[PDB]
Ligand binder design. Sequence first.
Ligand SMILES: [Cu+2]
Ligand SMILES: [Cu+2]
Ligand SMILES: [Cu+2]
Ligand SMILES: [Cu+2]
Lengths: 278, 78
Amino acid sequence: TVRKNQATLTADEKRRFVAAVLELKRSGRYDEFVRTHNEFIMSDTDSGERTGHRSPSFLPWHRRFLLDFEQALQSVDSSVTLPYWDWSADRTVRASLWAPDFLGGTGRSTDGRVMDGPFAASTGNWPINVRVDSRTYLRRSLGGSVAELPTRAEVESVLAISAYDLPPYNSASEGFRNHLEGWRGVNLHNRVHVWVGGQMATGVSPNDPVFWLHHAYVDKLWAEWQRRHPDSAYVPTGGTPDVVDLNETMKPWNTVRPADLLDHTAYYTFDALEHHHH
Amino acid sequence: AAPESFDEVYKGRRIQGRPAHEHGGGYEVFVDGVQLHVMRNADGSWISVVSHYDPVPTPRAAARAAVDELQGAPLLPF
Ligand SMILES: [Cu+2]
Ligand SMILES: [Cu+2]
Ligand SMILES: [Cu+2]
Ligand SMILES: [Cu+2]
């Protein structure tokens, strides 16, 4: 399995990815990923149990969640893999990402409703079922609530942070994980959710298929960080209340640990990933 | 110590807050009498399930951001 930059997919790969996503939606499997994510986003807290985000396991948890999702795609079409969206490079509303042949574009001004692409409510193929309000159509406001996506220089500043994570291992932490997640610093991952708007800015963000491409790029940045810092590794390493330690298993699967997910190459490779160097 | 309670009409909708599959929260917010899940971060900022990634300083600010996001839509219970 090779995960490719979305900007490079062939028209045939785009078609097959779109069809596989829509089949997971049709069969009811897609909405359960939305539901799982929402449960963790609403339950993880800075002073209590935290697993899916605001915590060191933000990265391995999303790596396994994305693997779950990619395996479900591959059960429909074994040729499909998750593409990633480098939002530092493809940073405008006119990126091919947002074209009608791929994810469709931004929402109309009146109600945020996405009007084109395969996931537009008018197709009949993308009901928003797992939701926090009455609206049942995909919404987006690209670049609405925040001016700009992160730039490469900003990403590089975070990649340069050597410590994986630091006590208190939450949204107040210093270190790489929380700067990539975005609760501190120039803000990478949280700001992208805000920039897309619509359901991507909410507690039911996998309702937008761009969620997967966003997180596939966050996951690639973890792999880039590892290459930059081969002397750094996941922390904490045991005995930390409320936090998933390196060799502890993670909900909801219960059968996998951060330790089992640190080396992505056991599961997939990237189209390009820079080697360690000085 | 929890923030103070509040009650106002914001953009035509009633928003209320009070100290008290999701977390055990010390504070409740309502939009037209439907509960809005909200959460406090370590630095004292607030988020909600309709604006989870954009911290705001207070629970009233989170309720107002939710009314802004909803564009008139009824909230569904969590
Ligand atoms: Cu998430
Ligand atoms: Cu996210
Ligand atoms: Cu070296
Ligand atoms: Cu809660």
